[PDB]
C-alpha cells in the first residue's frame, strides 16, 4: 500500500510566492526531497523535461492540480511533495485538451515503482475530487495542511 | 502538438469480449492478454508479467456499483500501446488496489499495454472519468461486443 508506505514530512508542504514560474515551483518541491535523498539530485530537471513532454495538469474544479513525477530510476525512496500556489499558474492538460489548467495545488510525486502509480493516483483522485478538501487547502497554514494530508493519507 | 496518449492508444475490435463464468483471475488475464499477443502489440510472455504484478501490486478499483480492475505489467514488456476489454459474466474478486482488506468484486477488466510510463497518468485520468460514469458502466454490462467496442471507441476520442 504505497499512500500507507510514502514519507510526507512536515517540509513537504510549502506556499509559494506569486512570482512562480512551472520550473520555479517544480525546483521548490522537489527540494526538499533532494535534501533528504529521497530523490537523485538532478530530479527537478528531469521532472521539468517530461512535464513539456507529457504534461500533468488535471483540470479540476474549482481548484486546478498538477501532479508532476519522472521516471522510478529517479526515486530512491517513495515521498510527495505538496506546494500551494497564491495565483494560479498553467500546466497543461494531462488528456490533451487545448485549453491550460489554472493550478493552485501542486501534489510531486517522487515513486521508486511505477506499480505504485495506481495506488497513488487512485487516491488522488479521491482527494482533488473533494471540493472542501481542496477548498481548505487554500486557506490552511503549512501546519494544518500537513496535519490534514498526513491523516488523509491514511 | 499535444502528446494524448489515448488518442494513440490501439483499440481494435478483437479487443473486447465477454468472459464465461468459470475464469479464475489468471484466465482473464491470458484471454485479454491473447489477442494483443497474437497481434504481436506485447512480448509473447506478457500474461505471465501481468499476473506477477497482479500478486504484489493489485489493480481492483472499488467502483461501485460495477467494480474493475486494470491489470498492467511494465513499459518494457509492451511493444505498442493498447487496451484490451473483458466483461465479465460474474464477479471476480480483484485485490484492493488501495490496499483495503476487502476484495473488488470486479465485472469489467481494462488491461492496459503501455510502452513508456510517462504516458499513464493520461490513460488513468481517462479510465477514472470513465469506470466512474456510472450510466456508462452499466450500460458495458448490457451490450453486446459490437456495441461495446464502439461504446469505448467513441468515449476514447
Redesign the interface.
Given at each position: 500500500?504505497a499512500?500507507?508506505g510514502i514519507h510526507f514530512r512536515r517540509h513537504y508542504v510549502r506556499h509559494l510566492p506569486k512570482e512562480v514560474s512551472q520550473n520555479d515551483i517544480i525546483k521548490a518541491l522537489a527540494s526538499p526531497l533532494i535534501n533528504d535523498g529521497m530523490v537523485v539530485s538532478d530530479f527537478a530537471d528531469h521532472v521539468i523535461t517530461?512535464e513539456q513532454?507529457?504534461?500533468?495538469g488535471?483540470p479540476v474544479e474549482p481548484v486546478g492540480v498538477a501532479?508532476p513525477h519522472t521516471?522510478?530510476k529517479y526515486v530512491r525512496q517513495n515521498a510527495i511533495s505538496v506546494g500551494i500556489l497564491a495565483e494560479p499558474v498553467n500546466f497543461?492538460?494531462?488528456?490533451?485538451?487545448?485549453d491550460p489548467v489554472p493550478v493552485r495545488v501542486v501534489f510531486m510525486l517522487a515513486l521508486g515503482?511505477?506499480?505504485?502509480?495506481?495506488?497513488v493516483?487512485?487516491?488522488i483522485?479521491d482527494v482533488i475530487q473533494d471540493e472542501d478538501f481542496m477548498q481548505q487547502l487554500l486557506v490552511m497554514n503549512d501546519d494544518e495542511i500537513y496535519q490534514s494530508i498526513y491523516t488523509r493519507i491514511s
Amino acid at each position: 500500500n504505497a499512500m500507507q508506505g510514502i514519507h510526507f514530512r512536515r517540509h513537504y508542504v510549502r506556499h509559494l510566492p506569486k512570482e512562480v514560474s512551472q520550473n520555479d515551483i517544480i525546483k521548490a518541491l522537489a527540494s526538499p526531497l533532494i535534501n533528504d535523498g529521497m530523490v537523485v539530485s538532478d530530479f527537478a530537471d528531469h521532472v521539468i523535461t517530461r512535464e513539456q513532454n507529457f504534461p500533468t495538469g488535471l483540470p479540476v474544479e474549482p481548484v486546478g492540480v498538477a501532479i508532476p513525477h519522472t521516471d522510478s530510476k529517479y526515486v530512491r525512496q517513495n515521498a510527495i511533495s505538496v506546494g500551494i500556489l497564491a495565483e494560479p499558474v498553467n500546466f497543461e492538460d494531462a488528456g490533451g485538451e487545448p485549453d491550460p489548467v489554472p493550478v493552485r495545488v501542486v501534489f510531486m510525486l517522487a515513486l521508486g515503482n511505477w506499480f505504485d502509480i495506481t495506488n497513488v493516483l487512485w487516491w488522488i483522485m479521491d482527494v482533488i475530487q473533494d471540493e472542501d478538501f481542496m477548498q481548505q487547502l487554500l486557506v490552511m497554514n503549512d501546519d494544518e495542511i500537513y496535519q490534514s494530508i498526513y491523516t488523509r493519507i491514511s
